[PDB]
Design a protein around this ligand. Structure first.
Ligand SMILES: Nc1ncnc2c1ncn2[C@H]1C[C@H](O)[C@@H](COP(=O)(O)OP(=O)(O)OP(=O)(O)O)O1
Ligand SMILES: Nc1ncnc2c1ncn2[C@H]1C[C@H](O)[C@@H](COP(=O)(O)OP(=O)(O)OP(=O)(O)O)O1
Ligand SMILES: Nc1ccn([C@H]2C[C@H](O)[C@@H](COP(=O)(O)OP(=O)(O)OP(=O)(O)O)O2)c(=O)n1
Ligand SMILES: Nc1ccn([C@H]2C[C@H](O)[C@@H](COP(=O)(O)OP(=O)(O)OP(=O)(O)O)O2)c(=O)n1
Ligand SMILES: [Mg+2]
Ligand SMILES: [Mg+2]
Ligand SMILES: [Mg+2]
Ligand SMILES: [Mg+2]
Lengths: 484, 479, 481, 480
């Protein structure tokens, strides 16, 4: 019928087009009210109670702001109301595929439960969207507001997941090359600068109790479309380059402080463990009454719709003896009897730890032979090793090398700006790995031992000296001249 | 040792290890799964916050105030033991809240168990007892210099009031300690201060009350042979503003017409599910949503999760309950018809609440109607808005002091402050909703409602002339 | 010439049309950088360093927001770019007439220096605007962007000061654009974008949180026909917020704008200006010399009249300025006139401006009945009478607001107080009386308190809040207390 | 005399001890109400109306917070109320020496007006403090609250300017940590930065990412090389690198804004042209100039941003040139920015060479057709040294940490133990060029000279180089 206004603490009063309201008021979208944006982070930052639902609204809103702003400044782009709605819908719907505890689910649980499968929340989002549309009669409503479901549904999915085919050339079908800039708004595959980041920086910071340094409104004011290699792309004003390096610095800061918090991660790990132990016994009803497991609900969207953080409490409150082991792990979380952090280190020089080797690392730690007197001997199964890849969103690459700029004197001429033209105070590398070790045995003597093994293992592997190495393992650190 | 927690409202808070021990229990962690504002989250999407983090905030502010009093007035002899007891009461005064907070004790329990008298306060005391006993907290209390017999009594009295000087946990010279966490005298306490700041931060409303300022100007003075907390005289304006703010937040957020109808629909689903949901309590015994309040072990497991357990159920017994919740997801809500108030001396009694839908349906609007509506099609919600003490002005129950004589307590009357203040401190709002959502039913509902307002001499609804143009002319008082 | 972007801490990045930039980059506008928004308030709230310049930008921006929003929701109103620019210019320029220390200048100084004259900053703003336009060749630039200077300059002035009887008293725009006159300075009910900026800005600087949400109000605003005029109407639901807006404004006056010490600093600075008025020379048109009190008669001189006057006096060496300089030095040492207390008339007693001067005499004539070391005279007392209201004297401004309902968005309606809440104010205007003593020693102050409380008793004013503590021998005589 | 409560928008309600109130309520301190914290920055960021006065209160407040927090956690340090007051006073008084438009005055004006002299606002602050104490009878009041003026005044001055071997006399080595609070000479981590980050951000419209309250919670005193020093928890090292990143961001965005700087430059020009004619009365009625008021504190007390308006509103023909420059600011007829570049070579451009740079630019021979020829005096070259506060050095190498397992054992943490994503260098220079000739043809020419000069000197390619000087940039293969 008519536009709704929603009060968001980040963005203020947002107007929602009635088509978007229709998309939001569905079981598939409302589901996101029951999935914490930061997963286990809430168990460390008590303000982070926010869910994916409200983040989704924010992304939808910002996507519309950016496309409206481009259209207002450059009418020659011929951006239609139809384009605007499609970009907003993609913004609203790019989080639809998230599972219980967000990144815990696709980062930890699915890889261990279904190692053969290749699943991402992105793929999930496309499938959920299709299901949402078909289950709720949205196509007619789309037609009613001037959308063309065939081409526009394709466009929306492409915005979320990228090209739907191997093209080897313009690989997209939803819109032609003259609207290429529309594909940079919601999920920017070229350099990662998109409205999804802008919402979460502001939102997460507001809830975590950290201040956000990046100003997206400013960026929107200075954004333009220019021709670059026969494509119309979004370009930033030259003097905004510093702000973009700061944007990636901020993202990395938030990962260091919050998203990869050592305890937040171990809680995610413990919850994953409980889910693995419960996977054989929890039943989720999907299409036609078929029963699915936590690990297989991703194969049926009707079942996936019912897969939320609620799983955690269903396990916790269970009485079935089959779920006793799973339930015991979650109860250890409530009593704050968590696996203990032992320490952190990094590979040196060129060493790069491969995903294939992740499983062998607890074995390596337990095989270390620290020359120290020990009351307990520990085994591989007592250790957890968490490898975390930190980067600027593009592996080893500098994402600012993939950004186009324009100058005040020639607003339609796109240019490139190299790192050396900006500052010598910027990073020389754009990717690194952190290795965290934890012990499942929490008593004082086990922990003392775990520390000796860990520091010995660092020495053996030529990893960096842990920050507290000399205090936790004073008998081990002297053997390594490189550390002294 | 002490833990540091980052709260977005208060910054980095330090927690004494005894408090950490209380927090890391199933009974306290439970509060992570109970939304502070209940159905409000379905209207204000930023209001995802739960009772857990509000509890931390209250505990922190309680310690701030008692610490500030001790530092300014060492002659009060506030001990570390006193400080911990006040902080614990602050942490634990929300323990008794049920699913969707005020929905549970404001709507559900009254309907499910009309004979019983339950408040979240009473719940908090029982939960606290259970928390202490289940988790071996008494020894830990002793280890930090608390005396469990007296101090547990003190903590409970702080939460629920008296279980002559009616308190046993502390003597009259420490009377001021009973004003911090839950202030029975005038409602000015640290619980409000946290929720103002917290709710505002998440709702997207800006808070006008400055509790840090109030703490800077607070003192203890002798008042009628009690040592009480007194405010500086010139802070009287800020206190009237505090109650104005609280009332604003109720108008805007806590009593939002749609937030309330969602709470009402969820309550309805819970009533229809109550016979079939089983919650396991002590010794494996089974309880219902409505009886879990009788066993704390069962109550520990009663959270907002009930909503999803119903929503995801496949049992045909829960089909009716499940349908109501599904209507929430599709946003097929009962429809708001309008709002009015009693005039003059009229006051609607709780005993009459159930007869009101019947009255509305009995109205005889002189208008042509496609459909005829029945009592069961109407919901009438009566909301009592006040400054926390019925008809009374809470500032008449506040003691002040002046800069020239800091130890001399005084009273300040409304007329000494401003003539721009309220003349009344309590009112009732009546909201009417229709369970029949189609265009023709709604049109009819509006005619009944406005006719009923006219019959009862209630105030003219704001949109009365637009929704019922044929009805409003009959009432000269309305024009 | 292209748009400039400016970063404001209240509003974020604001775009300024090149015509507005041209208006801003003039001596007449830049002048506002040297005039504190809150005057003597900075001497109490150290965060209130803000000046009228940045408040002006904010008002200009919000004016454009509201008119853009109305045009976007209701294209049938035919709001032109020309209309938008005129409203933004009026927003930018409505503070041009402010003098040194803002409300100190027209609230205290001019009334005492030039009692015969009737001056308001509004009138000042119109005159300054005219001077700004003419001095800087702005008329051609206006033409270049599609404005018609004759009509549009008239429109801008009318927005600031009102009509320069009749059904339609305005010449700048016809009745079908009536709603444009409600944006910058709303004469009908006071709800305008000037308040919205200062609520947000003052709060941000004072360290008080603002509770009024103007972005919400903009979303719900519409134009409807009311008594053959097109007016801005608010959604019915929003009536509570509007009462809260006036409550907030009153709160900010109580806490900040009428702070007892902020006011006494304003008073002392005014006193210094009065004692310096004969000796400070301000050069105006054709080299003529003016005084602080007469610079309002020449805009070229007025352009040079800012808070700088304070420091010119303070740093002076001329013995002529010794008395003025001494008062300002007392401010630096914080040897301020002392606050004695506050009271109010009872019920419907009202004090009038003609009587203000006789009040120090009345206080000094009181005969307390208490042992006193010192006897005080009329010249030792300052009596400050402050009229607090909701912007329209005794009237409820919400009775002058039009609303619409969700079921009929084009039908305007009225909402009375009783349809909203019984918890709202029963009166919308009141007076506060503050007494101060110029003699600051302990004994004088003790005495001043006895006179004050006795005078309250004699006049049947309300009992001061600390009356029983400051004058325990006086308050018992009054049973009503 | 009792405590006063003051409402600050950054810190909330702050309590001020009556001795501090006495120090504040003096002409020498109140002066700071008339000196903008960010100088010409207000002419670019309209929210930056804030003055040094309120920043000084903030620093005083934060200094007391930190010293109280250390005393509360570690009573064995024997921190006295006397220590607390001395640290708070130093915090309040470290900005006393600032001149008109803050860093414009000692960064630009004094170096040009008095090239022979070596003046810093720090030195100014000690001299102003001495003058404040003596002029206002503060010593007796200090005694009244248990201070010992001889040793405590020395302590306060040392906190501000450093030593006037354990080089300090105000306090012994067992109180070394007290010297790290207000102006930290060792690594730059002090409460002054914490206030200005929060305050500047609040006013500029930029969000601050550094959390000082958190840092205070984790701070401890430990023994390091026979000194008791403030140590940070090991975990917090990342936050400290972020602190310096933030400081550098604020310099890039705000403090060194290209237009903010050129306004500072133009105001400095006006002051130089007015210096012979403005008279400031100092001790015994002696007259001083803007450039010599630093030699008499009584005169310096009267030297504030007011000078700007005194010049602007002047009618004296002697001040006509100075007044014209300021009027160009009001009309926004500013010197024009031409561009920015950096050295590639490791030697920093030296301060001794700064003056020769406009000559070099004008001597460039761009191979381009030009309507106008420009001269050295038409160019301004601004050299800006950006660093993490310690020249080429990493300040985090000068920080001591402790671990949770051994709180009393101080340790060091090297860059490689933290991250590979951190800077490899900690100092750099930016070179900005501006033209005093503002017309279209002059500016076109200025751009050709500038880019040619960058090419000749092997500086980095300006960001818009290809657009502003398309005929010049091809000659340089390193840029292509
Ligand atoms: N860098 C940071 N900035 C802001 N908040 C943080 C940061 N790191 C953690 N927090 C939050 C999360 C918690 O609520 C609180 C305490 O976290 P943290 O200091 O890491 O405790 P911890 O228990 O993990 O460390 P430890 O046990 O090693 O002392 O602060
Ligand atoms: N109601 C208020 N809310 C917030 N800040 C306030 C309020 N009233 C005053 N302030 C500010 C102004 C000052 O920065 C600070 C102290 O002012 P205030 O409490 O009025 O002291 P005062 O010196 O005027 O009163 P007194 O000397 O009578 O105690 O608080
Ligand atoms: N005083 C208020 C009231 C509401 N909101 C927020 C809460 C909602 O997220 C959003 C829209 O709520 P409304 O009450 O304005 O809209 P409704 O749909 O309830 O009213 P209606 O449908 O009658 O327009 O605004 C707010 O910020 N301040
Ligand atoms: N990193 C920055 C730079 C500027 N600003 C603010 C300060 C100004 O008030 C406004 C405009 O600054 P710009 O530097 O963008 O404008 P200029 O005129 O300096 O740039 P140009 O003329 O080259 O567009 O934005 C900001 O918030 N952050
Ligand atoms: Mg609605
Ligand atoms: Mg810990
Ligand atoms: Mg510019
Ligand atoms: Mg005072």
């Amino acid at each position: 019928d008519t536009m709704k206004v929603i009060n968001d603490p980040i963005h203020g009063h947002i107007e929602l087009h009635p088509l978007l309201v229709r998309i939001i008021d569905t079981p598939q979208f409302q589901r996101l009210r029951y999935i914490k944006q930061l997963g286990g982070g809430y168990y460390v930052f008590p303000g982070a109670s926010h869910n994916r639902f409200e983040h989704s609204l924010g992304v939808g809103y910002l996507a519309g702001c950016l496309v409206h702003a481009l259209g207002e400044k450059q009418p020659e782009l011929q951006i239609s109301e139809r384009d605007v709605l499609c970009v907003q819908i993609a913004g609203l719907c790019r989080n639809l595929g998230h599972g219980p505890f967000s990144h815990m689910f696709d980062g930890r649980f699915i890889p261990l439960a279904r190692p053969e499968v290749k699943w991402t929340h992105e793929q999930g989002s496309v499938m959920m969207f299709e299901h949402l549309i078909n289950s709720n009669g949205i196509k007619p409503v789309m037609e009613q507001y001037g959308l063309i479901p065939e081409e526009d549904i394709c466009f929306i999915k492409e915005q979320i997941v990228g090209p739907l085919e191997s093209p080897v050339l313009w690989p997209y079908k939803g819109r032609p090359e003259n609207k290429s800039f529309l594909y940079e708004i919601v999920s920017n595959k070229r350099n990662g600068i998109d409205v999804d980041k802008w919402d979460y920086f502001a939102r997460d910071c507001h809830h975590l109790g950290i201040q956000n340094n990046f100003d997206y409104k400013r960026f929107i004011k200075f954004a333009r479309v220019c021709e670059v290699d026969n494509e119309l792309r979004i370009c930033a004003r030259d003097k905004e380059v510093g702000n973009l390096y700061d944007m990636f610095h901020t993202r990395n800061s938030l990962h260091r402080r919050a998203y990869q918090h050592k305890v937040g991660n171990i809680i995610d790990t413990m919850i994953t463990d409980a889910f693995l132990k419960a996977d054989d016994y929890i039943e989720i009803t999907g299409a036609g009454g078929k029963k699915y497991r936590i690990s297989t609900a991703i194969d049926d969207m009707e079942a996936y719709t019912k897969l939320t953080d609620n799983i955690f409490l269903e396990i916790l409150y269970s009485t079935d003896p089959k779920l006793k082991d799973a339930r015991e792990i979650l109860k250890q979380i409530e009593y704050r009897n968590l696996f203990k952090y032992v320490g952190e280190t990094q590979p040196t020089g060129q060493i790069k730890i491969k995903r294939e080797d992740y499983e062998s690392l607890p074995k390596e730690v337990a095989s270390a032979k620290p020359k120290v007197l020990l009351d307990v001997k520990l085994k591989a199964e007592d250790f957890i090793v968490d490898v975390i890849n930190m980067d600027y969103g593009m592996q080893e690459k500098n994402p600012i090398d993939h950004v186009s700029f324009y100058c005040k004197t020639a607003p339609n001429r796109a240019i490139r700006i190299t790192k050396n033209q900006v500052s010598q105070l910027l990073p020389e590398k754009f990717a690194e790995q952190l290795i965290r070790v934890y012990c499942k045995k929490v008593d004082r003597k086990s922990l003392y031992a775990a520390r000796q093994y860990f520091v010995q293992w660092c020495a053996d592997r030529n990893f960096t000296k842990p920050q507290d190495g000399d205090v936790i393992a004073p008998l081990i650190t002297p053997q390594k001249k490189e550390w002294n």
